[PDB]
Amino acid sequence: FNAKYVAEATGNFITVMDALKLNYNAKDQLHPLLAELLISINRVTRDDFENRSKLIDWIVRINKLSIGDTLTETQIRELLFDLELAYKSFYALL
Known part of the structure; x- marks a missing residue:
């Protein structure tokens, strides 16, 4: 694994999480963030993980949202939970 890529993906994980805790809920804001996260994850490895x-499925769901449509607060928690698991599972790979 390439160290600098790992470090990037780690940062990306923690950013999205942090953004969700700050209540980012628009397609506007999360689509780029997730795209970057997913690109970065993929750059360190193509291996699967929990x-x-x-997350891929989230980018589809998010992308499907109209402008000025927001994820619901239950969904923002769900996404956050998902990422926590994903990040833990990703960590296990290294």
Whole structure:
């Protein structure tokens, strides 16, 4: 694994999490963030991991949202929970 890529992906994980705790809920804000996260994850490895596909599935769901439509507060918690698992599962790979 390439160290600098790992470090990037780690940062990305923690950013999205941090953004969700700050109540980012628009497509506007989360689509770029997740795209980056997923690109970065993929750059360090193509191996699967617990909740990889769920995040992918989130980008679809998010992308499907109209402008000025927001994720619901239950959903923002769900996403956050998913990422925590994903990040833990990703960590296990290294």
